[PDB]
Design a binder for this molecule. Sequence first.
Ligand SMILES: Nc1ncnc2c1ncn2[C@@H]1O[C@H](COP(=O)(O)O)[C@@H](O)[C@H]1O
Ligand SMILES: Nc1ncnc2c1ncn2[C@@H]1O[C@H](COP(=O)(O)O)[C@@H](O)[C@H]1O
Lengths: 143, 143
Amino acid sequence: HEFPKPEFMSKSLEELQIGTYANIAMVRTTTPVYVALGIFVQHRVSALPVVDEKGRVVDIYSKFDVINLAAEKTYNNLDVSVTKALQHRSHYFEGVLKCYLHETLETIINRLVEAEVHRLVVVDENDVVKGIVSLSDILQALV
Amino acid sequence: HEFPKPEFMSKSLEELQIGTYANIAMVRTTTPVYVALGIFVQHRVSALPVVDEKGRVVDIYSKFDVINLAAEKTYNNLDVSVTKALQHRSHYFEGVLKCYLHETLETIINRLVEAEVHRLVVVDENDVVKGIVSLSDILQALV
Ligand SMILES: Nc1ncnc2c1ncn2[C@@H]1O[C@H](COP(=O)(O)O)[C@@H](O)[C@H]1O
Ligand SMILES: Nc1ncnc2c1ncn2[C@@H]1O[C@H](COP(=O)(O)O)[C@@H](O)[C@H]1O
């Protein structure tokens, strides 16, 4: 009773039916942090894909990013774009932002662990949002 | 419209009424990972204080810790204690595990950001659990 079972690890996200693929809440690179703050508190989601003018995912903005902004010693207000979080980290260029439905659970779990991130955005061939896979999604499938 | 407002940052957790102080789900240092996995999926909480034989908090076990276990290349099963997560990180010795009600939001936010952790356990003078403060708790108060 290996954990995880090898047969699970070799299956794809699509095969295991892992992730959320409807009603995804997301923002734009030009969205102010106040908009994200309001979504997090009132809509109750943990992270928001951030898309460019073409609809392509370039970041994911999380509750922790807001707290990190709050801790900055320099003066900020909430009118700053969510892209200021990119000064702290680049999920995009580290290859720990996106995934595809055909990737295996082994690949997804290793990518999450590589950068200690808690979700990935599932995208299409144009880097447009199809869904989100979070640690909760993976745990549900493991049981 | 500084973010966060300085008057918020100077107030304590108790003053701002931030955190969960009832119905805290928690485990022991001798608890197997399978028990934690079942709590995470069925009880739907994000992290679990881990307490020793005296009831004192010595770690906090999170969904990410399970995923980190899953990614280990060595052979594991779920009968291993939750304390195996301590091979990867020590929240305790880094001083990023616990907090007190009288600490300021500035102190709490800086401690969360220091180690990039998403919650702290609120404890008493004996390191026994009183509650949990997570990023969601802090955001609710910021709005
Ligand atoms: N931006 C989002 N929009 C919709 N669902 C989301 C979003 N972020 C996470 N989820 C889903 O919310 C559930 C809980 O995720 P987690 O908050 O990370 O515990 C999972 O099924 C995620 O796939
Ligand atoms: N082990 C736990 N038992 C009870 N409440 C918890 C626990 N962990 C987190 N919470 C609370 O669950 C809510 C959502 O936290 P978060 O999952 O981190 O978004 C917050 O009000 C936390 O204080």
